[PDB]
Amino acid sequence: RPALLILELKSYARGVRVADAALKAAPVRLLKCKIVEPGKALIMLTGRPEDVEKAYKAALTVANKGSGNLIDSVFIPAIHPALLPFLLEETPAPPLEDPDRALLFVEVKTVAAAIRAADAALRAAPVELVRMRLSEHIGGKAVFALVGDPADVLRAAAVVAEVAGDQLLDIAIIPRPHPALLGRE
């Protein structure tokens, strides 16, 4: 169970600065320090738990969290395995094998809270990601779809709504696919 650190900033040169300071403190590898639509800097880092944590508080001190420059900062010590193929690159999930599995779809404004809700749902609910997209050709939004049993899907929806709160922008539930959208959803 590796850790993650996410930084959403507006003064993206200041984001460069805070990333540089964070790696000054720690030998934490870099995942992505890039700007995305609509012009917001996104930073992803991972490494040893304590190392990531101390680098995180150092970065918080450096960037002056709470003054408006930081849209969101999310820390997490334990991350799900299936996240890594999704986060590192667009990895298409295997097609659904049981047509009975209902589908769940969400939408929140900020990516940091998006993956925060994703991790919270995964910890609370045994559900599996299928498709996901972050901050690219989107205008700042982010998506990720879920599939599974009706009861599991509904409880996961409840959990993700609770965690997202006001960050949520939309949610939807698809009861049943059929081959014209099964795989073609």
């Binding site: 509904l154 929806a157 949520l168 009861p175």
Partner: protein, 109 residues
């Protein structure tokens, strides 16, 4: 048919999650598909209800319309599931949730 009377002053996220969790509990307990499960709820003024000589304290009430052929044990399972789901959804003590259902006659539904 479900009708739920609730107090006013709840976040859209809160009642949204409440709807999802209630649907989850109903479907998992009675085993019906989502295609035949319908839920409706509304709110009332805080200065409007009385609860045992107290006025303004919150009180949630559940009304269900259900078809016969369900044994009493699964009826109790539905009751318990609904109670726990609502209580966890809004964090109010179970003494403030009153759940009631009605067997809609087969010649009636």
């Amino acid at each position: 048919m479900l009708v739920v009377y609730v107090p006013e002053g709840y976040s859209e996220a809160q009642k949204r999650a409440l709807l999802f969790r209630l649907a989850a509990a109903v479907v998992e307990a009675t085993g019906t598909p989502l295609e035949n499960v319908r839920i409706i709820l509304t709110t009332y003024a805080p200065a409007d209800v009385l609860l045992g000589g107290a006025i303004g304290v919150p009180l949630v009430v559940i009304l269900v319309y259900l078809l016969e052929g369900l044994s009493p044990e699964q009826k109790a399972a539905l009751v318990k599931a609904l109670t726990a789901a609502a209580a966890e959804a809004l964090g109010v003590d179970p003494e403030n949730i009153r759940v009631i259902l009605v067997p809609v006659p087969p010649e009636n539904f």
